[PDB]
Design a protein around this nucleic acid. Structure first.
Ligand code: DTP
Ligand code: CA
Length: 341
DNA sequence: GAGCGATACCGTG
DNA sequence: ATCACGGTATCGCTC
């Protein structure tokens, strides 16, 4: 099959740049402000102008201001991005009925039955970059190859505003040459677990014995890596249906006082129930990030759907259970709803 | 031996 | 020192 992946460049920033074009050329950093102290929080994304200097998603806002104190610092407007994203997405549906929306920012199309070869495919990805630039003034990167993983690796290798095909010969090349840590799904913890085992390239997972590999990363990621290195990975493009929806909020100050967490918790329920629309969940999970930045949950499933009032009273019970069964103070509290009708 | 909710870990956005 | 999603490993229960 032939897979075409679209990955919007610097999406949150670029949307801010489309809306306020005075911003082009300047470093923009979309932030998520927390409210413990002035400029506490983290970076959600920056544009290339800011990324050049080490201002990337995940760093604290204070560090980003130490590097680029004169950049534009914008509060995250996710609702807006989500709305633009939706419209870019309804636009990708013109090019294939088989479409898998992977994130706010990313979609895969199986165009197998709308092109014959990768030159036709390549051609369809210029069209699509054009259409999106025309309608929404947003640059994207396209990656084309014979499955989702190598279509995503192609986009990585081509961004920003790129397009690249990874034909069957280049796939065999990468399986040998490409550092396994750049394979989607291999993050730092498992990258290291591999290097530990000498695994540096994908091909390497075929000489190692399966249960040494399984015993180290998981049967599933083991099988995942092996199927790639055998060039036998095919995962169909499948439509995403959201499974959970939650919200966590950081408290002005740590605590384990029940009457002190309760308003943040209840704020988190309100927000999440609004984010649910007509989705009725049967499961609720309360979520506390410890003072130590660990994450510890407590949940309950129900024969029925969960009303907000059920949500309010069950969540307090679940938070009580978090505080008994642990001694660590709470930095942020939230909830996740799931198992929808 | 292996199928099921709770819960943690791990990846990416 | 953000928030969000969602896949998989592990346990204990259960057949
Ligand atoms: N750590 C993060 N926290 C919050 N939002 C994030 C984080 N990483 C990425 N995002 C959001 C903002 C990005 O616009 C969008 C897509 O991410 P990604 O493709 O990794 O980066 P990019 O589009 O900024 O280049 O996801
Ligand atoms: Ca992107």
């Amino acid at each position: 099959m032939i897979v075409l992946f679209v990955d919007f460049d610097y999406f949150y920033a670029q949307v801010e740049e489309v809306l306020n074009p005075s911003l082009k050329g300047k470093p923009v950093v979309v932030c998520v402000f927390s409210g413990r102290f002035e400029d506490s929080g983290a970076v959600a994304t920056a544009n290339y102008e800011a990324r050049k200097f080490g201002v990337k998603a995940g760093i604290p806002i204070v560090e980003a201001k130490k590097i680029l104190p004169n950049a534009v610092y914008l509060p995250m407007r996710k609702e807006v991005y989500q709305q633009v994203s939706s419209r870019i997405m309804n636009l990708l549906r013109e090019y294939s009925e088989k479409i898998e929306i992977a994130s706010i920012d990313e979609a895969y199309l199986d165009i197998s039955d709308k092109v014959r070869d990768y030159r036709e495919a390549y051609n369809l990805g210029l069209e699509i970059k054009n259409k999106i630039l025309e309608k929404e003034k947003i640059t994207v990167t396209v990656g084309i190859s014979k499955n989702k993983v190598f279509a995503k690796i192609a986009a990585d290798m081509a961004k920003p505003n790129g397009i690249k095909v990874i034909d069957d010969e280049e796939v065999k090349r990468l399986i040998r040459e490409l550092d396994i840590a750049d394979v989607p799904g291999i993050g730092n913890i498992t990258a290291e677990k591999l290097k530990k085992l000498g695994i540096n390239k994908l091909v390497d997972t075929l000489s190692i014995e399966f249960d040494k590999l399984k015993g180290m990363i998981g049967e599933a990621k083991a099988k995942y890596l092996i199927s790639l290195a055998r060039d036998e990975y095919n995962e169909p493009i499948r439509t995403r249906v959201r499974k959970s929806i939650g919200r966590i909020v950081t408290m002005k100050r740590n605590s384990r006082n029940l009457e002190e967490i309760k308003p943040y918790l209840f704020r988190a329920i309100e927000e999440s129930y609004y984010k649910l629309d007509k989705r009725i969940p049967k499961a609720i999970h309360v979520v506390a990030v410890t003072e130590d930045l660990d994450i510890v949950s407590r949940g309950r499933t129900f024969p029925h759907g969960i009303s907000k009032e059920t949500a309010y009273s069950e969540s307090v019970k679940l938070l009580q259970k978090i505080l008994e069964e642990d001694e660590r103070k709470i930095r942020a509290i939230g909830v996740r709803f799931s198992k929808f009708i």
